[PDB]
């Protein structure tokens, strides 16, 4: 028995209570939002100006020479040559996208420098060779040659006095003393994997050897190997393992090789097929016929269990350096690294702080050092006290690691 609407009762509502300023305030807000629009299309000042030089230098070119470089200039294409025959051109030339022609040389060429597999400038009408080219270099390995120093010294990787000692043996020592390996009769390993918990210092050891290398170092973006086209990712592998053979002793660092292939299965007849072709091409240019010589490979992962046993074989990855948690002497050295460059009280002790971080990483220790200064900005201070750090330990660890054991603690004292 509840119904309360009828068109006459609609006219009750919108006249009761501020009949003076109801529409008087509303349409002012309405047409100003219309006026927000009508300013915008009246401006219209987008101005995507690009391509043009400063207009004080090209004046000589675009007087007649630009008109002189329309009709006499050529729109010739570049191609590749298969071979040649004797006494004549008989040149067999492909495009790999267009067809394959058999054409003649032109007048402006020397018939000696028409060697096979050479990029050559080809006419559009009669398709004659005009200009030979320098060979093609791969465009994306140039993008990932680092050419840049990240600034991390070995004095910042504290807590790892022995993991650096294993890593010093493989990378640095044959590149500076290639004598004692031969003068005793051994060979250095050529592949090192890094595995362990996250935030432990995997990237730091890779970032610090890019500082002190004195050699070719190549970061490799992992998901550039995965492409849209079939077989394209496998071709990217090849160009990487050719130019490494040209120069001597270049370093290649992969990172998170969990992504580029971890297991080879087929039960539902399909899946990560194209990823396997790129991943198996990586294997055959790692071991197989034509061993690589002086190419050192570094890999790092967080989930080492799910990797292919084809990569777990030594000869491809030879040293298994793992990272663990620093016991106590490691952590007391880590606090002195991450808190030396901050305004603290000059009398505090750090060994009491290293107690209260039992199962912690180097990332978690630095988060305590940053958070303790944030409490100093909650108050109005410019130096850190002891209780600033003690509240920071409870904020980082104890706010997430335990909630039942701290209040109801009376089983342990």
């Amino acid at each position: 028995p509840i119904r309360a609407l009828d068109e006459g009762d609609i006219a009750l509502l919108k006249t009761y209570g501020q009949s003076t300023y109801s529409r008087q305030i509303k349409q002012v807000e309405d047409d100003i939002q219309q006026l927000l629009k009508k300013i915008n299309e009246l401006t219209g000042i987008k101005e995507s100006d690009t391509g043009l030089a400063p207009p004080a230098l090209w004046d000589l070119a675009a007087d007649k020479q630009t008109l002189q470089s329309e009709q006499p200039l050529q729109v010739a294409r570049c191609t590749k040559i298969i071979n040649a025959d004797s006494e004549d051109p008989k040149y067999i030339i492909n495009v790999k996208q267009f067809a394959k022609f058999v054409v003649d040389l032109s007048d402006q060429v020397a018939p000696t420098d028409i060697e096979e597999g050479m990029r050559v400038g080809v006419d559009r009408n009669k398709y004659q060779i005009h200009i030979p080219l320098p060979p093609k270099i791969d465009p994306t390995v140039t993008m990932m040659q680092v050419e840049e120093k990240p600034d991390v010294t070995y004095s910042d990787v504290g807590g790892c006095k022995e993991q650096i000692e294993k890593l010093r043996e493989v990378v640095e020592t044959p590149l500076l003393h290639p004598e004692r390996f031969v003068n005793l009769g051994i060979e250095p390993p050529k592949g090192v994997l890094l595995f362990g918990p996250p935030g432990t210092g995997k990237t730091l050891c890779a970032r610090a050897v890019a500082n002190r290398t004195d050699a070719c170092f190549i970061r490799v973006i992992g998901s550039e190997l995965v492409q849209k086209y079939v077989g394209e990712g496998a071709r990217m592998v090849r160009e990487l393992f050719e130019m490494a053979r040209t120069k001597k002793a270049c370093l290649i660092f992969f990172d998170e090789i969990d992504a580029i292939g971890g297991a080879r299965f087929d039960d539902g007849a399909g899946g990560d097929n194209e990823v396997q072709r790129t991943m198996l091409e990586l294997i055959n240019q790692l071991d197989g016929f034509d061993p690589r010589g002086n190419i050192k490979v570094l890999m790092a992962t967080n989930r080492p269990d799910t990797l292919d046993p084809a990569l777990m074989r030594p000869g491809r990855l030879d040293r298994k350096i793992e990272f663990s948690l620093p016991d106590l002497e490691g952590r007391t050295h880590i606090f002195k690294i991450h808190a030396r460059s901050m305004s603290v009280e000059r009398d505090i002790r750090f060994e009491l702080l290293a107690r209260l971080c039992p199962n912690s990483t180097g990332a978690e220790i630095r988060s305590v050092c940053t958070e303790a200064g944030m409490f100093a900005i909650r108050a109005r201070r410019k130096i850190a006290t002891e209780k600033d750090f003690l509240e920071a330990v409870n904020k980082v660890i104890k706010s997430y690691a335990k909630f039942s054991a701290t209040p109801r603690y009376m089983t342990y004292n």
Binding site: K96, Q97, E169, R180, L184, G185, I186, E187, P188, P189, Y229, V230, G231, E232, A234, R235, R264, D266, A269, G270, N273, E274, Q276, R277, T278, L280, E281, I283, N284, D287, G288, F289, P309, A310, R313, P314, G315, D318, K320, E322
Partner: protein, 219 residues
Amino acid sequence: KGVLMYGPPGTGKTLLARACAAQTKATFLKLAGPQLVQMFIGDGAKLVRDAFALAKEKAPSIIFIDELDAIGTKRFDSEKAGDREVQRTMLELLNQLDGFQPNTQVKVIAATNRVDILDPALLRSGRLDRKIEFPMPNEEARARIMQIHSRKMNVSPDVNYEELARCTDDFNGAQCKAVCVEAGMIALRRGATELTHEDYMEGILEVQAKKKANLQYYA
């Protein structure tokens, strides 16, 4: 005319085929698995057939194919191309291999690590047929290989490789090579001039990445 190698992936499949290319002069033709996959349409069957016509021009030429399971997969139907050029590269391998009579001169060698990817009914009769499996080294074959790679070092002559095969178990041929490499550098740590049985035992634990403390149970 068809020989297939299979087994666990550390036994020496590639290591065996390099020696056959070494001592024989009969125009060895290496070929990898994922080399036949190309981006444009129909290019792999060009690359399959031209190399087989090349190896037919030379009489004694024999062909090695590594990771045949890179293309030798259970073929599945689709609607967005994808694998629908690989079988045209696969069947061209199947058409050419049945294309000529089995007169021994162009013997073909293949080798995979996992059998369960390959197409078993597609070989079975006159295709890749001979099964040469590579098992793991038993006891003395481990002690033989560790003696092979230790030929080039200063080994003190109180080391029995049979005593090493006591503690080394379930290893392939490459992990036996890895013990031999790591033991040379442990002696390099303390600057030792020759090796010892203790030097190998620490090199064993480094392969599977172990370490030992004082465990306070053991007096």
